[PDB]
Structure 1
Amino acid sequence: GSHMDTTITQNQTGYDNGYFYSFWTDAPGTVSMTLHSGGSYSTSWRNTGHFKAGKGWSTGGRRTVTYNASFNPSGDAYLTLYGWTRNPLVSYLIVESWGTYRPTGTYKGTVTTDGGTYDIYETWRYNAPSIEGTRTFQIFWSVRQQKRTSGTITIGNHFDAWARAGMNLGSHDYQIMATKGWQSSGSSTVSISE
């Protein structure tokens, strides 16, 4: 990378090189994120707990985003467009790739977009870290049926499919192209653009 890159190890949000970024983990010291130029960042993690890290936008919406990634999980991790809404309090994931485990939940249907078919799922997390604290909230999922690590995500197509399936989003908080890890190790480099 560049000597001007910044390596992040503490929970934080902010802006870097034109883009919002978020870094969150319950396992500090097990994961780091390096913020590169433009829409790029890398992560490196080792026997972590839970982390989510990525670049994107502080306010999500129906963006058409293009991303290129190198995604190298050892164990449970996702490469995913990740975001939050409030009222309803929902975390949503458009999962592009995963490691050892393909995330699934309550089947809600399918959506075909950006040359790929995604299964739609809903899950709940109970008493869990959220943008509003320890809460019980919904997760909306679009999980691609086959892994990919570059391409375009027409986010509005996912939002529309979810609405058709009765899954309603609230007011948008942040929206990032994220690396997300659970009790695993690995690395990633992710580059995005709108």
Structure 2
Amino acid sequence: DTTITQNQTGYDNGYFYSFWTDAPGTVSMTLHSGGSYSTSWRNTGHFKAGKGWSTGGRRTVTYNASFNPSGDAYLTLYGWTRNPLVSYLIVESWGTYRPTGTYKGTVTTDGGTYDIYETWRYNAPSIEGTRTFQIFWSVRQQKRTSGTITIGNHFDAWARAGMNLGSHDYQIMATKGWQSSGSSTVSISE
């Protein structure tokens, strides 16, 4: 297995991965076989790490996870588009705080009901550099740590709500953390 501690993307055991933090040395990601990885973090800053695909799309993804946050963290499908510049999250579980934004509707899919939100992020890290951009959210109403995500059902609900996606960059089943400690192990597949 490979331990990642510096911002990078690449491929491991057939799958794209991405690691990003603004607090190097406080978080690591261990790449396991197939679509599997773990993370460990301690009094960190911001971090996002996961395996998935370098070009996102309307995939039906199945994941199985162990998720043990001590504070603010998400277990979430995460990705980016350009033209327009958008980041999006399908949040399956969280730690101390359930994320919210401007309410936009609800979508029911894969046995659960999700609230839909939009937020704006100002002068923040993006795939293009420091930029201002929209975040699209589907947040499950009840936490879960395994199951299937029919991503097309979220994209379509967002579009019905006036939330328009662009050309896809990467798409990962991510662990994301903010000023917390914890661990995770996440195993994905299309």
TM-score (norm: length of structure 1) = 0.98
Q: Deviation at 1:102? A: 0.3
- Matched residue of 2:84: which SS? coil
1:91-149 per-position Cα deviation (integer Å, ceiling 9, x unaligned):
00000000000000000000000000000000010000000000000000000001000
1:16-60 per-position Cα deviation (integer Å, ceiling 9, x unaligned):
011000000000000000000000000000000000000000000
RMSD between aligned residues: 0.3
* CA–CA distance in structure 2, aligned partners of residues 18 and 67 of structure 1: 16
Q: Deviation at 1:173? A: 0.2
* CA–CA distance in structure 2, aligned partners of residues 29 and 147 of structure 1: 29
* CA–CA distance in structure 1, aligned partners of residues 44 and 120 of structure 2: 22
Structure 2 equivalent of residue 96 of structure 1? 92
1:150-186 per-position Cα deviation (integer Å, ceiling 9, x unaligned):
0000000000000000000000000000000000000
* CA–CA distance in structure 1, aligned partners of residues 79 and 93 of structure 2: 16
Q: Deviation at 1:191? A: 0.1
* CA–CA distance in structure 2, aligned partners of residues 131 and 77 of structure 1: 21
1:68-100 per-position Cα deviation (integer Å, ceiling 9, x unaligned):
000000000000000000011000000000000
Show structure 2 runs of 5+ residues with no match: none
* CA–CA distance in structure 1, aligned partners of residues 115 and 83 of structure 2: 24
- Matched residue of 2:87: which SS? strand
Show structure 1 runs of 5+ residues with no match: none
Note if 1:142 corresponds to 2:135.
no
* CA–CA distance in structure 2, aligned partners of residues 52 and 79 of structure 1: 10
User: 1:27-66 residue pairs with structure 2 within 5 A?
Assistant: 27-66=23-62
Q: Deviation at 1:15? A: 0.3
Q: Deviation at 1:187? A: 0.2
- Matched residue of 2:158: which SS? helix
* CA–CA distance in structure 1, aligned partners of residues 46 and 83 of structure 2: 25
Structure 2 equivalent of residue 78 of structure 1? 74
Identity %: 100
User: 1:1-194 residue pairs with structure 2 within 5 A?
Assistant: 5-194=1-190
* CA–CA distance in structure 2, aligned partners of residues 126 and 186 of structure 1: 27
- Matched residue of 2:81: which SS? strand
